Amino acid sequence: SMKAIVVINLVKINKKIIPDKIYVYRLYSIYRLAYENVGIVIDPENLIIATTKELEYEGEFIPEGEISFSELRNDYQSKLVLRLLKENGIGEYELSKLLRKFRKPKTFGDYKVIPSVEMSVIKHDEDFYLVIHIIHQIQSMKTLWELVNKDPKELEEFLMTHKENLMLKDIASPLKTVYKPCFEEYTKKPKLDHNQEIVKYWYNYHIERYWNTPEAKLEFYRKFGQVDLKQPAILAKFASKNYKIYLLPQLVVPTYNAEQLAKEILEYTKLMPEERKELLENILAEVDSDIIDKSLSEIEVEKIAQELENKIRVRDDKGNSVPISQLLWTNYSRKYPVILPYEVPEKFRKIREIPMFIILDSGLLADIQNFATNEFRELVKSMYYEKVITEDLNSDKGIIEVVEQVSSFMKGKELGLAFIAARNKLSSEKFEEIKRRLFNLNVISQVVNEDTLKNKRDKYDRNRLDLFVRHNLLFQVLSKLGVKYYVLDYRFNYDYIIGIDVAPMKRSEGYIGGSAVMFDSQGYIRKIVPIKIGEQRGESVDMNEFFKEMVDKFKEFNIKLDNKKILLLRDGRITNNEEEGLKYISEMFDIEVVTMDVIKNHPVRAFANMKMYFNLGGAIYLIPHKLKQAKGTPIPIKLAKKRIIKNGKVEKQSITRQDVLDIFILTRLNYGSISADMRLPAPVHYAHKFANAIRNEWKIKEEFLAEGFLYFV
């Protein structure tokens, strides 16, 4: 509706920081060289660096003469300023220390939460601003070897389960270098080696090279103890940035980027808008430099109308239509609400019966178990516009028994449904395993955990789940079956909106390069597809082949893209290779391709909890929704470098209010997912979920995927 002024985590930089003279040069590393000479890297390819000091290099190089700050493209101007700020004592190291004077590290169990600041420079129009963003690292205070109780057959299990986010810090090194453990390509098997020679060698290596003194040696042995030959070596690589290094679990600790991922921890890392604001002001007061302003910048933003919140609606079997946003005599019954779909996969027309499974975690108290089955019984009834299984879902043996019992009742059946009540304690892995295995049996499942069961009860009937939750449970199940249970009072100015995800994996007669999810201009998901690709030549995915297969695959699925207008999106920035690949598919098929960078991982924060969007540095930041329950500061989606591709030609465009509206709508298609945390446009979000399921061994039922069944979500 109206505009508003909000404080953001940027502070104006004084122009007196701009360097008088810049020196261009053409040829440890080139990045470190540029850095040591108080400069940056211009052309990573042609090894072109720009320095503000007299280049000192005992190697070959040709000075490309001097240059002025005005000639550098914006990106490099900001990068050069970032480096200059560091020279005045304003860097992540210094300011992270200042932050910890106010927000101290805190330990939970064996883990320590470490606050620090991530810094960058943004050029708004003619000015430069320093972005100071508070983040957190989660570091084990126990070595990986100690964490797994020195058991080889527990260590490998650890690596596999935390594979996606686990990093390992070599605390036995003065550089505390961080690594990423290597894995058996296309698998979850970590690359380990029980060769005692490897272990002895690298263990001794640390001592010889870093603590070669009686005193340092003593401390080393006090801290890590003698070499444990029973531990295998971990093949890994640098986390920063092809080399591969060996690590000893006895000398490394697991580390995690909090923002990239328990309960008590999660809390501590979530900072309310006012807390971040204050902490930043504290750091600013402690910074004894005039090179940057002393207060945080404010910016005028555009609010988003409450009306744009009611464009998605559902209806009952009568004639009532209400938008997703939630006395009568019948309000006493446990009957679930009635939802009348706008579209139902034609598949259900033929289907005979649909077996119904109620899976109860034996760990749940009897009364919780009874509550759940009664909730599920009513959910299935409304589901229509029974086998009860009780086992120890927190044990591998219980899960195996469930699958066996269900497979036995599903033979000769086309589709089944499983409603699962489980304790909150189950690992993410066990939940995923349960769901994937049931699906191999053509059984779609819906999980309701103990937390929802105990804390979301209707105020007027404690033996009934909340009305809000009930609607969303019904929405979730319906979406898993490809049902168009809602209608969008909006039309996208595109033929199709497509989300893609690039993640190489190998499957039985497949070798898949990624996925793609398609929605029509009406806001309905229609097709979900894997993107088969041949073996890669160079260390890079051939996007021309990728997109060509995307188009051909959709055709196999009954949708021809050539001659149409589509919005194509991915998680993050559109790479040069992806643009080429898109120019390729544009000319070859006469596809008018509109695309842009959709960035969820950036450091910019607006200290207000409300829906809005604003232009900063040429990019648009959009907060799709405010935090209604959880603690924390909203994370904006960053939109930038929009472009149009016609007949193989690229024309850089400008982001419009309409574009922000589209992204906004696409972000509101969460399909019942309680606790709206989907920070990405639905097409992209689901593409990523599908790519994940394929990498996790989920069966690929093209029959279901062709009707938009989100069964893996």
Is residue 539 flagged as an active site residue? yes
User: Which among 559, 597, 569, 598 has a CA at the least distance from the CA of 499?
Assistant: 569
Q: Is 131 annotated as a binding residue?
A: no
Backbone torsions φ then ψ of 135, nearest 5 degrees? -130, 175
Is residue 571 flagged as an active site residue? yes
Q: Is 552 annotated as a binding residue?
A: no
Which tokens is 443 given?
A: 């059984």
Instruction: Answer for the pair 481, 344: CB distance below 8 angstroms, yes or no.
Output: no
Listed in sequence order, the DSSP H helices in 414-466 are 428-440, 450-455
Which tokens is 438 given?
A: 């049931």
Q: How many residues does the chain have?
A: 713
Beta carbons within 8 Å of 51's beta carbon, 6+ residues apart = 22, 23, 25, 34, 37, 38, 39
Beta bridge partners of 416: 443
334-344 CB burial, b ≥16 within 10 A, e <16: eebeebebeeb
Find the catalytic residue in 542, 571, 659, 707. Answer: 571
Beta bridge partners of 657: none
Q: Is 625 annotated as a binding residue?
A: no
Q: Is 288 annotated as a binding residue?
A: no
Supply the DSSP symbol for 573. Answer: P
Which tokens is 708 given?
A: 């938009």
End-to-end CA distance of the chain: 35
> Given CA atoms 557, 562, 564, 568 in this order, what sign does their dihedral have?
positive
User: Which among 304, 323, 319, 337 has a CA at the least distance from the CA of 469?
Assistant: 337
Is residue 597 flagged as an active site residue? no
Is residue 688 flagged as an active site residue? yes
DSSP string, 576-620: HHHHHHHHHHHHHHT-EEEEEEEES-----BSS-S-EEEEETTEE
Give dist(CA 505, CA 545) in Å, integer.
16
Instruction: Answer for the pair 24, 65: CB distance below 8 angstroms, yes or no.
Output: yes
Which tokens is 71 given?
A: 């000639």
User: Which among 388, 380, 324, 390 has a CA at the least distance from the CA of 353?
Assistant: 380
Instruction: Answer for the pair 582, 557: CB distance below 8 angstroms, yes or no.
Output: no
Question: Residue type for 555, please?
Answer: K
CA distances from 459 to 14, 406, 450, 455, 673 (A): 57, 35, 18, 11, 22
Instruction: Answer for the pair 139, 18: CB distance below 8 angstroms, yes or no.
Output: no
Listed in sequence order, the DSSP H helices in 441-492 are 450-455, 467-480
Find the catalytic residue in 495, 501, 549, 662. Answer: 501
Three-class SS state of 134:
strand
Find the catalytic residue in 20, 346, 539, 651. Answer: 539
Backbone torsions φ then ψ of 359, nearest 5 degrees? -105, 115
In this structure, the number of other CB atoms found within 10 A of the CB of residue 631 comes to 12
Residues contributing to the annotated binding site for Mn(2+):
501, 571, 688, 713
Catalytic site positions = 501, 539, 571, 688
Residues contributing to the annotated binding site:
501, 571, 688, 713
